[PDB]
């Protein structure tokens, strides 16, 4: 039967709903939360723009190599372990943003499992200084 469009529809629905969820999550935020989030976009895009060549070489070590996850987590978190500076956190976040930007045909879960749990906790630790580094 007509089954040559099944995988296409399957891929688009796992994109549509995820984009609707994001809209729903962004909908239940006040003007302050939206202001901070907007600063994150412009900040991370600025770094990925001016440090694209640096990120690219770091990416080439992380990506093309067929190694399991969490190896990547321990690979990246080391910067957050020694230095708990907001600048390092922002630099780390921008790099993850680059990875998620290049892994479009890969599973969304493969990127989120790197971000969530212990990693997002460390970036959030003393986040008041993190915001003041971005919002000023």
């Amino acid at each position: 039967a007509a089954i040559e469009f099944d995988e296409i529809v399957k891929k688009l629905l796992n994109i549509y709903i995820n984009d609707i969820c994001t809209t729903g999550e962004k909908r239940l935020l006040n003007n302050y939360e939206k202001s901070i989030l907007d600063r994150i976009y412009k900040s991370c895009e600025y770094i990925k723009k001016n440090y694209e060549l640096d990120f690219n070489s770091m990416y080439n070590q992380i990506n093309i190599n067929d190694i399991t996850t969490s190896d990547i987590k321990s690979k990246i978190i080391e910067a957050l372990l020694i230095d708990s500076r907001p600048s390092v956190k922002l630099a780390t976040l921008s790099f993850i943003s680059l990875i998620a930007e290049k892994w479009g045909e890969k599973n969304r879960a493969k990127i989120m499992e790197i971000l969530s749990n212990e990693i997002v906790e460390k970036i959030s630790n003393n986040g008041k200084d993190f915001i003041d580094f971005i919002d000023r």
Partner: peptide, 19 residues
């Protein structure tokens, strides 16, 4: 052997260097 840790620190250093 190309430590991403060292690079991220170096990037973070150049970031807060500008004020």
């Amino acid at each position: 052997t190309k430590k991403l840790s060292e690079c991220l620190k170096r990037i973070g250093d150049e970031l807060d260097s500008n004020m």
